[PDB]
């Protein structure tokens, strides 16, 4: 159970974005139905009044929280991967538009899931803004909590993978457009019951075996991190 508070741009807090530049849902409950329209941008997908200005090459940091800013972020039980996707805003997230910019899943090197790292990072994870066309975009940050994912939601709706989805409105101002954005995948649609990484037993299946759901990270993506970029208590 987690939500996006706001974003940082090059280590500068853009302030509370909830219902402002984040298409915030009403609460922190997961999406679970893989065919749901709610897979696009969560349960209240609508235009919000502000879009955060960035330039290509900026570090854009999403900041998550549980109940209040800079709290426990997400329950530690919620082990799973983190991904970020981009789509042109005019799409409203519809059709074959979502391009993956970032994936972290299980990290053998230090025996962490992405979610574990997110908690350590005070809810903060980042992407480099890609060299796409100037204009308005949706950045879709997605946490998959796997603690109940040994069952399919379609078999038992009390369980299943849990999707914490947040769409931020981002305006890319300066960009040389050296990596034009291609068509992408649909949400809903890209994840199905058989997709790798949707049905997974963290209790009995080795985490080193986990494969995150496709699609693969786009060739144009410039990277990211899961790491604190600024101290929210420093304000
Ligand atoms: Cl839960
Ligand atoms: Cl950190
Ligand atoms: Cl099942
Ligand atoms: Cl990949
Ligand atoms: Cl490319
Ligand atoms: Cu939860």
JSON list of C-alpha atoms and ligand atoms in Angstrom, two decimals:
[
{"chain": "A", "resi": 1, "resn": "UNK", "atom": "CA", "xyz": [0.00, 0.00, 0.00]},
{"chain": "A", "resi": 2, "resn": "UNK", "atom": "CA", "xyz": [1.93, 3.04, -1.27]},
{"chain": "A", "resi": 3, "resn": "UNK", "atom": "CA", "xyz": [1.47, 6.25, -3.31]},
{"chain": "A", "resi": 4, "resn": "UNK", "atom": "CA", "xyz": [3.58, 8.91, -4.98]},
{"chain": "A", "resi": 5, "resn": "UNK", "atom": "CA", "xyz": [3.96, 12.16, -3.01]},
{"chain": "A", "resi": 6, "resn": "UNK", "atom": "CA", "xyz": [5.79, 14.12, -5.65]},
{"chain": "A", "resi": 7, "resn": "UNK", "atom": "CA", "xyz": [8.96, 14.26, -7.73]},
{"chain": "A", "resi": 8, "resn": "UNK", "atom": "CA", "xyz": [12.40, 15.82, -7.65]},
{"chain": "A", "resi": 9, "resn": "UNK", "atom": "CA", "xyz": [14.23, 17.21, -10.70]},
{"chain": "A", "resi": 10, "resn": "UNK", "atom": "CA", "xyz": [18.07, 17.19, -10.42]},
{"chain": "A", "resi": 11, "resn": "UNK", "atom": "CA", "xyz": [17.76, 16.91, -6.66]},
{"chain": "A", "resi": 12, "resn": "UNK", "atom": "CA", "xyz": [15.28, 19.83, -6.35]},
{"chain": "A", "resi": 13, "resn": "UNK", "atom": "CA", "xyz": [11.97, 18.91, -4.70]},
{"chain": "A", "resi": 14, "resn": "UNK", "atom": "CA", "xyz": [9.02, 19.92, -6.86]},
{"chain": "A", "resi": 15, "resn": "UNK", "atom": "CA", "xyz": [6.74, 19.82, -3.84]},
{"chain": "A", "resi": 16, "resn": "UNK", "atom": "CA", "xyz": [3.55, 17.87, -3.07]},
{"chain": "A", "resi": 17, "resn": "UNK", "atom": "CA", "xyz": [2.15, 16.73, -6.40]},
{"chain": "A", "resi": 18, "resn": "UNK", "atom": "CA", "xyz": [-0.87, 14.80, -5.18]},
{"chain": "A", "resi": 19, "resn": "UNK", "atom": "CA", "xyz": [-3.85, 15.68, -7.42]},
{"chain": "A", "resi": 20, "resn": "UNK", "atom": "CA", "xyz": [-1.67, 18.50, -8.82]},
{"chain": "A", "resi": 21, "resn": "UNK", "atom": "CA", "xyz": [0.86, 16.87, -11.23]},
{"chain": "A", "resi": 22, "resn": "UNK", "atom": "CA", "xyz": [0.29, 13.26, -10.13]},
{"chain": "A", "resi": 23, "resn": "UNK", "atom": "CA", "xyz": [-2.96, 11.59, -11.32]},
{"chain": "A", "resi": 24, "resn": "UNK", "atom": "CA", "xyz": [-3.42, 10.38, -7.75]},
{"chain": "A", "resi": 25, "resn": "UNK", "atom": "CA", "xyz": [-5.94, 7.67, -6.93]},
{"chain": "A", "resi": 26, "resn": "UNK", "atom": "CA", "xyz": [-8.21, 8.07, -3.88]},
{"chain": "A", "resi": 27, "resn": "UNK", "atom": "CA", "xyz": [-6.19, 5.75, -1.68]},
{"chain": "A", "resi": 28, "resn": "UNK", "atom": "CA", "xyz": [-3.18, 3.43, -1.56]},
{"chain": "A", "resi": 29, "resn": "UNK", "atom": "CA", "xyz": [-5.01, 0.21, -2.44]},
{"chain": "A", "resi": 30, "resn": "UNK", "atom": "CA", "xyz": [-3.52, -1.92, -5.22]},
{"chain": "A", "resi": 31, "resn": "UNK", "atom": "CA", "xyz": [-4.80, -2.64, -8.67]},
{"chain": "A", "resi": 32, "resn": "UNK", "atom": "CA", "xyz": [-4.95, -6.41, -9.18]},
{"chain": "A", "resi": 33, "resn": "UNK", "atom": "CA", "xyz": [-7.20, -7.13, -12.20]},
{"chain": "A", "resi": 34, "resn": "UNK", "atom": "CA", "xyz": [-4.82, -7.44, -15.16]},
{"chain": "A", "resi": 35, "resn": "UNK", "atom": "CA", "xyz": [-7.57, -6.60, -17.73]},
{"chain": "A", "resi": 36, "resn": "UNK", "atom": "CA", "xyz": [-8.75, -3.53, -15.83]},
{"chain": "A", "resi": 37, "resn": "UNK", "atom": "CA", "xyz": [-8.75, -0.05, -17.35]},
{"chain": "A", "resi": 38, "resn": "UNK", "atom": "CA", "xyz": [-7.24, 0.80, -13.93]},
{"chain": "A", "resi": 39, "resn": "UNK", "atom": "CA", "xyz": [-3.94, -0.79, -15.05]},
{"chain": "A", "resi": 40, "resn": "UNK", "atom": "CA", "xyz": [-3.22, 2.31, -17.15]},
{"chain": "A", "resi": 41, "resn": "UNK", "atom": "CA", "xyz": [-2.85, 4.96, -14.49]},
{"chain": "A", "resi": 42, "resn": "UNK", "atom": "CA", "xyz": [-4.74, 3.55, -11.46]},
{"chain": "A", "resi": 43, "resn": "UNK", "atom": "CA", "xyz": [-8.39, 4.12, -10.63]},
{"chain": "A", "resi": 44, "resn": "UNK", "atom": "CA", "xyz": [-8.67, 7.90, -11.25]},
{"chain": "A", "resi": 45, "resn": "UNK", "atom": "CA", "xyz": [-6.95, 8.55, -14.56]},
{"chain": "A", "resi": 46, "resn": "UNK", "atom": "CA", "xyz": [-7.74, 12.18, -15.57]},
{"chain": "A", "resi": 47, "resn": "UNK", "atom": "CA", "xyz": [-5.81, 15.30, -16.51]},
{"chain": "A", "resi": 48, "resn": "UNK", "atom": "CA", "xyz": [-4.56, 17.14, -13.41]},
{"chain": "A", "resi": 49, "resn": "UNK", "atom": "CA", "xyz": [-3.77, 20.84, -13.49]},
{"chain": "A", "resi": 50, "resn": "UNK", "atom": "CA", "xyz": [0.05, 20.87, -13.58]},
{"chain": "A", "resi": 51, "resn": "UNK", "atom": "CA", "xyz": [2.84, 19.12, -15.68]},
{"chain": "A", "resi": 52, "resn": "UNK", "atom": "CA", "xyz": [6.47, 19.21, -14.15]},
{"chain": "A", "resi": 53, "resn": "UNK", "atom": "CA", "xyz": [9.00, 20.81, -16.54]},
{"chain": "A", "resi": 54, "resn": "UNK", "atom": "CA", "xyz": [12.16, 18.86, -17.25]},
{"chain": "A", "resi": 55, "resn": "UNK", "atom": "CA", "xyz": [14.85, 18.68, -19.90]},
{"chain": "A", "resi": 56, "resn": "UNK", "atom": "CA", "xyz": [16.28, 15.53, -21.50]},
{"chain": "A", "resi": 57, "resn": "UNK", "atom": "CA", "xyz": [19.18, 14.29, -19.33]},
{"chain": "A", "resi": 58, "resn": "UNK", "atom": "CA", "xyz": [17.65, 15.52, -16.07]},
{"chain": "A", "resi": 59, "resn": "UNK", "atom": "CA", "xyz": [17.40, 13.10, -13.18]},
{"chain": "A", "resi": 60, "resn": "UNK", "atom": "CA", "xyz": [13.68, 12.68, -12.39]},
{"chain": "A", "resi": 61, "resn": "UNK", "atom": "CA", "xyz": [13.04, 11.13, -8.97]},
{"chain": "A", "resi": 62, "resn": "UNK", "atom": "CA", "xyz": [9.69, 9.71, -7.85]},
{"chain": "A", "resi": 63, "resn": "UNK", "atom": "CA", "xyz": [9.02, 9.78, -4.10]},
{"chain": "A", "resi": 64, "resn": "UNK", "atom": "CA", "xyz": [6.64, 7.22, -2.61]},
{"chain": "A", "resi": 65, "resn": "UNK", "atom": "CA", "xyz": [4.98, 7.11, 0.85]},
{"chain": "A", "resi": 66, "resn": "UNK", "atom": "CA", "xyz": [2.59, 4.86, 2.80]},
{"chain": "A", "resi": 67, "resn": "UNK", "atom": "CA", "xyz": [0.36, 7.16, 4.96]},
{"chain": "A", "resi": 68, "resn": "UNK", "atom": "CA", "xyz": [2.51, 10.31, 5.49]},
{"chain": "A", "resi": 69, "resn": "UNK", "atom": "CA", "xyz": [5.56, 11.66, 3.71]},
{"chain": "A", "resi": 70, "resn": "UNK", "atom": "CA", "xyz": [8.87, 9.88, 4.45]},
{"chain": "A", "resi": 71, "resn": "UNK", "atom": "CA", "xyz": [7.25, 7.19, 6.64]},
{"chain": "A", "resi": 72, "resn": "UNK", "atom": "CA", "xyz": [7.86, 3.42, 6.24]},
{"chain": "A", "resi": 73, "resn": "UNK", "atom": "CA", "xyz": [7.08, 3.91, 2.49]},
{"chain": "A", "resi": 74, "resn": "UNK", "atom": "CA", "xyz": [5.59, 0.45, 1.90]},
{"chain": "A", "resi": 75, "resn": "UNK", "atom": "CA", "xyz": [5.29, -2.61, 4.14]},
{"chain": "A", "resi": 76, "resn": "UNK", "atom": "CA", "xyz": [8.46, -4.69, 3.99]},
{"chain": "A", "resi": 77, "resn": "UNK", "atom": "CA", "xyz": [6.35, -7.78, 3.15]},
{"chain": "A", "resi": 78, "resn": "UNK", "atom": "CA", "xyz": [5.68, -6.24, -0.28]},
{"chain": "A", "resi": 79, "resn": "UNK", "atom": "CA", "xyz": [8.86, -7.58, -1.94]},
{"chain": "A", "resi": 80, "resn": "UNK", "atom": "CA", "xyz": [8.86, -7.15, -5.71]},
{"chain": "A", "resi": 81, "resn": "UNK", "atom": "CA", "xyz": [10.17, -5.23, -8.72]},
{"chain": "A", "resi": 82, "resn": "UNK", "atom": "CA", "xyz": [9.89, -1.58, -9.82]},
{"chain": "A", "resi": 83, "resn": "UNK", "atom": "CA", "xyz": [9.50, -0.33, -13.36]},
{"chain": "A", "resi": 84, "resn": "UNK", "atom": "CA", "xyz": [8.97, 3.05, -15.00]},
{"chain": "A", "resi": 85, "resn": "UNK", "atom": "CA", "xyz": [7.24, 3.52, -18.37]},
{"chain": "A", "resi": 86, "resn": "UNK", "atom": "CA", "xyz": [6.68, 6.60, -20.56]},
{"chain": "A", "resi": 87, "resn": "UNK", "atom": "CA", "xyz": [3.88, 7.42, -23.03]},
{"chain": "A", "resi": 88, "resn": "UNK", "atom": "CA", "xyz": [2.94, 10.57, -24.93]},
{"chain": "A", "resi": 89, "resn": "UNK", "atom": "CA", "xyz": [0.32, 12.44, -22.92]},
{"chain": "A", "resi": 90, "resn": "UNK", "atom": "CA", "xyz": [-2.09, 12.83, -25.85]},
{"chain": "A", "resi": 91, "resn": "UNK", "atom": "CA", "xyz": [-2.61, 9.04, -25.76]},
{"chain": "A", "resi": 92, "resn": "UNK", "atom": "CA", "xyz": [-4.06, 9.23, -22.24]},
{"chain": "A", "resi": 93, "resn": "UNK", "atom": "CA", "xyz": [-2.20, 5.96, -21.79]},
{"chain": "A", "resi": 94, "resn": "UNK", "atom": "CA", "xyz": [-4.45, 4.18, -24.31]},
{"chain": "A", "resi": 95, "resn": "UNK", "atom": "CA", "xyz": [-3.29, 1.79, -27.03]},
{"chain": "A", "resi": 96, "resn": "UNK", "atom": "CA", "xyz": [0.21, 0.53, -27.77]},
{"chain": "A", "resi": 97, "resn": "UNK", "atom": "CA", "xyz": [2.09, 3.41, -26.17]},
{"chain": "A", "resi": 98, "resn": "UNK", "atom": "CA", "xyz": [4.01, 2.45, -23.00]},
{"chain": "A", "resi": 99, "resn": "UNK", "atom": "CA", "xyz": [7.79, 2.25, -23.37]},
{"chain": "A", "resi": 100, "resn": "UNK", "atom": "CA", "xyz": [9.84, 0.89, -20.48]},
{"chain": "A", "resi": 101, "resn": "UNK", "atom": "CA", "xyz": [12.56, 3.20, -19.15]},
{"chain": "A", "resi": 102, "resn": "UNK", "atom": "CA", "xyz": [13.66, 1.27, -16.05]},
{"chain": "A", "resi": 103, "resn": "UNK", "atom": "CA", "xyz": [13.47, -2.12, -14.40]},
{"chain": "A", "resi": 104, "resn": "UNK", "atom": "CA", "xyz": [14.84, -3.41, -11.09]},
{"chain": "A", "resi": 105, "resn": "UNK", "atom": "CA", "xyz": [13.74, -6.77, -9.71]},
{"chain": "A", "resi": 106, "resn": "UNK", "atom": "CA", "xyz": [15.88, -8.99, -7.48]},
{"chain": "A", "resi": 107, "resn": "UNK", "atom": "CA", "xyz": [19.49, -7.95, -6.90]},
{"chain": "A", "resi": 108, "resn": "UNK", "atom": "CA", "xyz": [21.64, -11.02, -6.05]},
{"chain": "A", "resi": 109, "resn": "UNK", "atom": "CA", "xyz": [24.71, -8.83, -5.42]},
{"chain": "A", "resi": 110, "resn": "UNK", "atom": "CA", "xyz": [23.15, -7.58, -2.10]},
{"chain": "A", "resi": 111, "resn": "UNK", "atom": "CA", "xyz": [20.10, -9.96, -1.73]},
{"chain": "A", "resi": 112, "resn": "UNK", "atom": "CA", "xyz": [17.51, -7.12, -2.15]},
{"chain": "A", "resi": 113, "resn": "UNK", "atom": "CA", "xyz": [14.31, -6.74, -4.05]},
{"chain": "A", "resi": 114, "resn": "UNK", "atom": "CA", "xyz": [13.74, -3.33, -5.62]},
{"chain": "A", "resi": 115, "resn": "UNK", "atom": "CA", "xyz": [11.03, -2.62, -3.02]},
{"chain": "A", "resi": 116, "resn": "UNK", "atom": "CA", "xyz": [13.51, -3.30, -0.19]},
{"chain": "A", "resi": 117, "resn": "UNK", "atom": "CA", "xyz": [15.88, -0.79, -1.75]},
{"chain": "A", "resi": 118, "resn": "UNK", "atom": "CA", "xyz": [13.05, 1.72, -2.15]},
{"chain": "A", "resi": 119, "resn": "UNK", "atom": "CA", "xyz": [12.36, 1.65, 1.59]},
{"chain": "A", "resi": 120, "resn": "UNK", "atom": "CA", "xyz": [16.09, 2.23, 2.30]},
{"chain": "A", "resi": 121, "resn": "UNK", "atom": "CA", "xyz": [15.97, 5.13, -0.22]},
{"chain": "A", "resi": 122, "resn": "UNK", "atom": "CA", "xyz": [13.13, 6.85, 1.69]},
{"chain": "A", "resi": 123, "resn": "UNK", "atom": "CA", "xyz": [10.78, 6.11, -1.19]},
{"chain": "A", "resi": 124, "resn": "UNK", "atom": "CA", "xyz": [12.96, 7.58, -3.92]},
{"chain": "A", "resi": 125, "resn": "UNK", "atom": "CA", "xyz": [13.85, 6.11, -7.30]},
{"chain": "A", "resi": 126, "resn": "UNK", "atom": "CA", "xyz": [14.98, 7.91, -10.44]},
{"chain": "A", "resi": 127, "resn": "UNK", "atom": "CA", "xyz": [15.22, 7.83, -14.20]},
{"chain": "A", "resi": 128, "resn": "UNK", "atom": "CA", "xyz": [17.22, 9.90, -16.62]},
{"chain": "A", "resi": 129, "resn": "UNK", "atom": "CA", "xyz": [14.78, 11.81, -18.83]},
{"chain": "A", "resi": 130, "resn": "UNK", "atom": "CA", "xyz": [15.21, 10.36, -22.35]},
{"chain": "A", "resi": 131, "resn": "UNK", "atom": "CA", "xyz": [16.06, 12.27, -25.55]},
{"chain": "A", "resi": 132, "resn": "UNK", "atom": "CA", "xyz": [12.49, 12.10, -26.91]},
{"chain": "A", "resi": 133, "resn": "UNK", "atom": "CA", "xyz": [10.54, 14.84, -28.71]},
{"chain": "A", "resi": 134, "resn": "UNK", "atom": "CA", "xyz": [9.76, 17.93, -26.62]},
{"chain": "A", "resi": 135, "resn": "UNK", "atom": "CA", "xyz": [6.20, 17.79, -25.35]},
{"chain": "A", "resi": 136, "resn": "UNK", "atom": "CA", "xyz": [3.87, 16.40, -22.71]},
{"chain": "A", "resi": 137, "resn": "UNK", "atom": "CA", "xyz": [4.33, 12.90, -21.33]},
{"chain": "A", "resi": 138, "resn": "UNK", "atom": "CA", "xyz": [3.00, 10.51, -18.72]},
{"chain": "A", "resi": 139, "resn": "UNK", "atom": "CA", "xyz": [5.60, 8.74, -16.60]},
{"chain": "A", "resi": 140, "resn": "UNK", "atom": "CA", "xyz": [4.03, 5.56, -15.16]},
{"chain": "A", "resi": 141, "resn": "UNK", "atom": "CA", "xyz": [5.85, 4.28, -12.09]},
{"chain": "A", "resi": 142, "resn": "UNK", "atom": "CA", "xyz": [4.86, 0.73, -11.16]},
{"chain": "A", "resi": 143, "resn": "UNK", "atom": "CA", "xyz": [5.66, -1.32, -8.04]},
{"chain": "A", "resi": 144, "resn": "UNK", "atom": "CA", "xyz": [4.59, -4.98, -8.14]},
{"chain": "A", "resi": 145, "resn": "UNK", "atom": "CA", "xyz": [4.26, -6.45, -4.63]},
{"chain": "A", "resi": 146, "resn": "UNK", "atom": "CA", "xyz": [4.56, -10.23, -4.81]},
{"chain": "A", "resi": 147, "resn": "UNK", "atom": "CA", "xyz": [3.68, -11.37, -1.27]},
{"chain": "A", "resi": 148, "resn": "UNK", "atom": "CA", "xyz": [0.38, -12.89, -2.43]},
{"chain": "A", "resi": 149, "resn": "UNK", "atom": "CA", "xyz": [1.40, -13.61, -6.03]},
{"chain": "A", "resi": 150, "resn": "UNK", "atom": "CA", "xyz": [1.56, -17.40, -5.77]},
{"chain": "A", "resi": 151, "resn": "UNK", "atom": "CA", "xyz": [-2.11, -17.27, -6.75]},
{"chain": "A", "resi": 152, "resn": "UNK", "atom": "CA", "xyz": [-3.55, -15.57, -9.77]},
{"chain": "A", "resi": 153, "resn": "UNK", "atom": "CA", "xyz": [-6.09, -12.84, -8.97]},
{"chain": "A", "resi": 154, "resn": "UNK", "atom": "CA", "xyz": [-8.23, -14.44, -11.69]},
{"chain": "A", "resi": 155, "resn": "UNK", "atom": "CA", "xyz": [-8.35, -17.66, -9.59]},
{"chain": "A", "resi": 156, "resn": "UNK", "atom": "CA", "xyz": [-8.75, -16.03, -6.17]},
{"chain": "A", "resi": 157, "resn": "UNK", "atom": "CA", "xyz": [-9.47, -12.32, -6.06]},
{"chain": "A", "resi": 158, "resn": "UNK", "atom": "CA", "xyz": [-8.35, -12.02, -2.45]},
{"chain": "A", "resi": 159, "resn": "UNK", "atom": "CA", "xyz": [-4.78, -12.66, -3.64]},
{"chain": "A", "resi": 160, "resn": "UNK", "atom": "CA", "xyz": [-2.56, -12.04, -6.67]},
{"chain": "A", "resi": 161, "resn": "UNK", "atom": "CA", "xyz": [0.23, -9.72, -7.63]},
{"chain": "A", "resi": 162, "resn": "UNK", "atom": "CA", "xyz": [-0.47, -6.16, -6.45]},
{"chain": "A", "resi": 163, "resn": "UNK", "atom": "CA", "xyz": [0.20, -3.21, -8.71]},
{"chain": "A", "resi": 164, "resn": "UNK", "atom": "CA", "xyz": [0.89, 0.22, -7.23]},
{"chain": "A", "resi": 165, "resn": "UNK", "atom": "CA", "xyz": [0.67, 2.46, -10.31]},
{"chain": "A", "resi": 166, "resn": "UNK", "atom": "CA", "xyz": [1.23, 6.22, -10.39]},
{"chain": "A", "resi": 167, "resn": "UNK", "atom": "CA", "xyz": [1.20, 8.49, -13.44]},
{"chain": "A", "resi": 168, "resn": "UNK", "atom": "CA", "xyz": [3.05, 11.79, -13.31]},
{"chain": "A", "resi": 169, "resn": "UNK", "atom": "CA", "xyz": [2.48, 14.59, -15.85]},
{"chain": "A", "resi": 170, "resn": "UNK", "atom": "CA", "xyz": [5.91, 15.63, -17.13]},
{"chain": "A", "resi": 171, "resn": "UNK", "atom": "CA", "xyz": [6.67, 18.27, -19.78]},
{"chain": "A", "resi": 172, "resn": "UNK", "atom": "CA", "xyz": [9.95, 17.76, -21.65]},
{"chain": "A", "resi": 173, "resn": "UNK", "atom": "CA", "xyz": [11.16, 21.22, -22.78]},
{"chain": "A", "resi": 174, "resn": "UNK", "atom": "CA", "xyz": [14.71, 20.93, -24.15]},
{"chain": "A", "resi": 175, "resn": "UNK", "atom": "CA", "xyz": [15.64, 17.69, -25.96]},
{"chain": "A", "resi": 176, "resn": "UNK", "atom": "CA", "xyz": [17.67, 16.98, -29.09]},
{"chain": "A", "resi": 177, "resn": "UNK", "atom": "CA", "xyz": [15.23, 14.12, -29.92]},
{"chain": "A", "resi": 178, "resn": "UNK", "atom": "CA", "xyz": [18.19, 11.80, -30.62]},
{"chain": "A", "resi": 179, "resn": "UNK", "atom": "CA", "xyz": [15.99, 8.81, -29.53]},
{"chain": "A", "resi": 180, "resn": "UNK", "atom": "CA", "xyz": [12.50, 9.21, -30.88]},
{"chain": "A", "resi": 181, "resn": "UNK", "atom": "CA", "xyz": [9.95, 7.31, -28.77]},
{"chain": "A", "resi": 182, "resn": "UNK", "atom": "CA", "xyz": [8.67, 4.15, -30.52]},
{"chain": "A", "resi": 183, "resn": "UNK", "atom": "CA", "xyz": [5.29, 2.50, -30.11]},
{"chain": "A", "resi": 184, "resn": "UNK", "atom": "CA", "xyz": [5.03, 0.50, -26.89]},
{"chain": "A", "resi": 185, "resn": "UNK", "atom": "CA", "xyz": [2.78, -1.90, -25.05]},
{"chain": "A", "resi": 186, "resn": "UNK", "atom": "CA", "xyz": [-0.75, -1.49, -23.82]},
{"chain": "A", "resi": 187, "resn": "UNK", "atom": "CA", "xyz": [-1.83, -1.25, -20.17]},
{"chain": "A", "resi": 188, "resn": "UNK", "atom": "CA", "xyz": [-4.08, -3.08, -19.64]},
{"chain": "A", "resi": 189, "resn": "UNK", "atom": "CA", "xyz": [-2.90, -5.85, -21.95]},
{"chain": "A", "resi": 190, "resn": "UNK", "atom": "CA", "xyz": [0.85, -6.32, -21.63]},
{"chain": "A", "resi": 191, "resn": "UNK", "atom": "CA", "xyz": [0.53, -8.41, -18.42]},
{"chain": "A", "resi": 192, "resn": "UNK", "atom": "CA", "xyz": [-1.54, -11.57, -18.52]},
{"chain": "A", "resi": 193, "resn": "UNK", "atom": "CA", "xyz": [-1.85, -14.61, -16.24]},
{"chain": "A", "resi": 194, "resn": "UNK", "atom": "CA", "xyz": [0.96, -16.43, -18.08]},
{"chain": "A", "resi": 195, "resn": "UNK", "atom": "CA", "xyz": [3.34, -13.48, -18.25]},
{"chain": "A", "resi": 196, "resn": "UNK", "atom": "CA", "xyz": [6.66, -14.16, -16.48]},
{"chain": "A", "resi": 197, "resn": "UNK", "atom": "CA", "xyz": [6.81, -12.48, -13.15]},
{"chain": "A", "resi": 198, "resn": "UNK", "atom": "CA", "xyz": [3.05, -12.19, -12.43]},
{"chain": "A", "resi": 199, "resn": "UNK", "atom": "CA", "xyz": [2.51, -15.54, -10.71]},
{"chain": "A", "resi": 200, "resn": "UNK", "atom": "CA", "xyz": [5.48, -16.13, -8.41]},
{"chain": "A", "resi": 201, "resn": "UNK", "atom": "CA", "xyz": [5.93, -17.75, -4.97]},
{"chain": "A", "resi": 202, "resn": "UNK", "atom": "CA", "xyz": [8.52, -15.73, -3.03]},
{"chain": "A", "resi": 203, "resn": "UNK", "atom": "CA", "xyz": [8.30, -18.25, -0.15]},
{"chain": "A", "resi": 204, "resn": "UNK", "atom": "CA", "xyz": [9.32, -21.34, -2.19]},
{"chain": "A", "resi": 205, "resn": "UNK", "atom": "CA", "xyz": [10.74, -20.13, -5.52]},
{"chain": "A", "resi": 206, "resn": "UNK", "atom": "CA", "xyz": [14.27, -18.71, -5.45]},
{"chain": "A", "resi": 207, "resn": "UNK", "atom": "CA", "xyz": [14.34, -14.96, -6.01]},
{"chain": "A", "resi": 208, "resn": "UNK", "atom": "CA", "xyz": [17.36, -15.53, -8.26]},
{"chain": "A", "resi": 209, "resn": "UNK", "atom": "CA", "xyz": [14.91, -17.34, -10.63]},
{"chain": "A", "resi": 210, "resn": "UNK", "atom": "CA", "xyz": [12.48, -14.33, -10.84]},
{"chain": "A", "resi": 211, "resn": "UNK", "atom": "CA", "xyz": [12.04, -12.76, -14.28]},
{"chain": "A", "resi": 212, "resn": "UNK", "atom": "CA", "xyz": [10.21, -9.46, -14.33]},
{"chain": "A", "resi": 213, "resn": "UNK", "atom": "CA", "xyz": [7.34, -9.09, -16.73]},
{"chain": "A", "resi": 214, "resn": "UNK", "atom": "CA", "xyz": [8.25, -7.92, -20.22]},
{"chain": "A", "resi": 215, "resn": "UNK", "atom": "CA", "xyz": [8.61, -5.68, -22.10]},
{"chain": "A", "resi": 216, "resn": "UNK", "atom": "CA", "xyz": [12.35, -5.26, -22.01]},
{"chain": "A", "resi": 217, "resn": "UNK", "atom": "CA", "xyz": [13.83, -1.86, -21.21]},
{"chain": "A", "resi": 218, "resn": "UNK", "atom": "CA", "xyz": [13.89, 0.29, -24.38]},
{"chain": "A", "resi": 219, "resn": "UNK", "atom": "CA", "xyz": [17.22, 0.68, -26.16]},
{"chain": "A", "resi": 220, "resn": "UNK", "atom": "CA", "xyz": [16.82, 4.45, -25.92]},
{"chain": "A", "resi": 221, "resn": "UNK", "atom": "CA", "xyz": [16.48, 4.50, -22.18]},
{"chain": "A", "resi": 222, "resn": "UNK", "atom": "CA", "xyz": [19.32, 6.23, -20.33]},
{"chain": "A", "resi": 223, "resn": "UNK", "atom": "CA", "xyz": [19.09, 4.45, -16.97]},
{"chain": "A", "resi": 224, "resn": "UNK", "atom": "CA", "xyz": [18.11, 5.12, -13.40]},
{"chain": "A", "resi": 225, "resn": "UNK", "atom": "CA", "xyz": [18.64, 4.24, -9.77]},
{"chain": "A", "resi": 226, "resn": "UNK", "atom": "CA", "xyz": [16.94, 3.45, -6.49]},
{"chain": "A", "resi": 227, "resn": "UNK", "atom": "CA", "xyz": [18.57, 5.89, -4.07]},
{"chain": "A", "resi": 228, "resn": "UNK", "atom": "CA", "xyz": [17.76, 8.91, -2.02]},
{"chain": "A", "resi": 229, "resn": "UNK", "atom": "CA", "xyz": [18.44, 12.15, -3.94]},
{"chain": "A", "resi": 230, "resn": "UNK", "atom": "CA", "xyz": [17.31, 14.55, -1.21]},
{"chain": "A", "resi": 231, "resn": "UNK", "atom": "CA", "xyz": [16.31, 14.59, 2.44]},
{"chain": "A", "resi": 232, "resn": "UNK", "atom": "CA", "xyz": [12.63, 15.48, 2.80]},
{"chain": "A", "resi": 233, "resn": "UNK", "atom": "CA", "xyz": [13.23, 16.39, 6.45]},
{"chain": "A", "resi": 234, "resn": "UNK", "atom": "CA", "xyz": [15.84, 19.03, 5.30]},
{"chain": "A", "resi": 235, "resn": "UNK", "atom": "CA", "xyz": [12.91, 21.36, 4.25]},
{"chain": "B", "resi": 1, "resn": "LIG", "atom": "CL1", "xyz": [-1.62, -6.57, 1.25]},
{"chain": "B", "resi": 2, "resn": "LIG", "atom": "CL1", "xyz": [19.61, 5.47, -0.45]},
{"chain": "B", "resi": 3, "resn": "LIG", "atom": "CL1", "xyz": [-3.88, -19.55, -8.85]},
{"chain": "B", "resi": 4, "resn": "LIG", "atom": "CL1", "xyz": [15.42, -5.39, -20.00]},
{"chain": "B", "resi": 5, "resn": "LIG", "atom": "CL1", "xyz": [17.54, 3.86, -29.45]},
{"chain": "B", "resi": 6, "resn": "LIG", "atom": "CU1", "xyz": [-0.10, -3.15, 0.61]}
]
